[PDB]
Amino acid sequence: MKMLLIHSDYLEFEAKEKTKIAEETENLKGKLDECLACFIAVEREDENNPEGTAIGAVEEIEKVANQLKVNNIVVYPYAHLSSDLSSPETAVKVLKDIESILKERGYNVLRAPFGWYKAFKISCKGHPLSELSRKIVA
Amino acid sequence: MKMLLIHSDYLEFEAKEKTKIAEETENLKGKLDECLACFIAVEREDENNPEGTAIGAVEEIEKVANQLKVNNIVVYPYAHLSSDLSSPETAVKVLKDIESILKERGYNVLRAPFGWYKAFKISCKGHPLSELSRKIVA
Ligand SMILES: C[C@@H](O)[C@H](N)C(=O)N[C@H]1[C@@H](O)[C@H](n2cnc3c(N)ncnc32)O[C@@H]1CO
Ligand SMILES: C[C@@H](O)[C@H](N)C(=O)N[C@H]1[C@@H](O)[C@H](n2cnc3c(N)ncnc32)O[C@@H]1CO
């Protein structure tokens, strides 16, 4: 897995158009103030263990989010972070599990729609730990 | 080289803190509207031909800018896109070259300062061609 964590003043998104692999979603729009925007590409290597990958992901998000003491998390699918991607079915599963585990761990979570073209607005805080990239293993 | 090209309503930035390799500059604050925000990671392979990499990158930016009829370009150093980076000195050279060549080809260019932690704000348009990733080889 590849992840970009952006410590943000806000993140808003608006689904605009479906791709062929668009997911049913219960929020085509969303806004979250002061958050860790986690842009995630679920990778082919992640298919070896999708459940372990979601745990590995939450573990790393916690590591950074505890270091910033942020409780607000956006799970934002972002395929462009990798050139060797997982299947859409597996990616959706991992992203949904990440949201589930984080919610279970008392985090405030917003998940952007998988497989939709989305307008978005983000403001990065710009401190030395405000943009971090992480490679994640199960 | 890895680039992510985002068709944006705006890109704004504010350099906040220096790193070890912060470039010396006056342009520490900036904004461009209706722009192609080009997040660029210069890679180890690019060291073999820095000028050629720059020319290749400009060619791809032009293809997208011409397809979307965009004239405003932001050159944004973004190491996060790649796990196999060139040296810092190589990276700034190539980024500076991309900026100078785009300028000589008639584009309005703003380059975000290299080696500074920066706050930034962006708004992605969200149409199907608004977020494109490209590998550049030279
Ligand atoms: C394009 C860009 O602007 C947009 N933001 C986009 O990335 N769209 C992707 C992801 O939301 C999702 N998707 C498919 N596979 C994956 C994967 N392995 N990991 C994460 N997302 C995936 O499906 C869309 C088309 O590939
Ligand atoms: C901090 C982070 O969130 C910020 N946004 C950042 O990416 N900072 C990078 C670039 O500005 C630049 N830089 C150094 N090497 C490279 C490279 N190979 N390619 C591109 N830029 C580089 O130097 C910084 C640290 O590597």
Author numbering:
A (entry chain A), B (entry chain B): 5 to 142
Lines from the paper:
We have been interested in a D-aminoacyl-tRNA deacylase (DTD) fold that is present across the domains of life in two different functional contexts: as an N-terminal editing domain (NTD) of archaeal ThrRS, which specifically removes non-cognate L-serine mischarged on tRNAThr, and as a freestanding ‘chiral proofreading' enzyme, which removes D-amino acids from tRNAs in bacteria and eukaryotes.
In the case of MjNTD, L-Ser3AA and L-Thr3AA complex were crystallized in C2 and P21 space groups with six and four monomers, respectively, in the asymmetric unit corresponding to three and two dimers. However, a clear and complete ligand density was observed in only chain A in the case of MjNTD co-crystals and therefore only this monomer was used for analysis. The possible reason for this could be the remarkably low binding affinity for the ligand in MjNTD, as revealed by binding studies later in this section. There was a clear activity against L-Ser-(Ec)tRNAThr while no deacylation was observed against L-Thr-(Ec)tRNAThr even though Wat1 was present in both L-Ser3AA- and L-Thr3AA-bound structures.
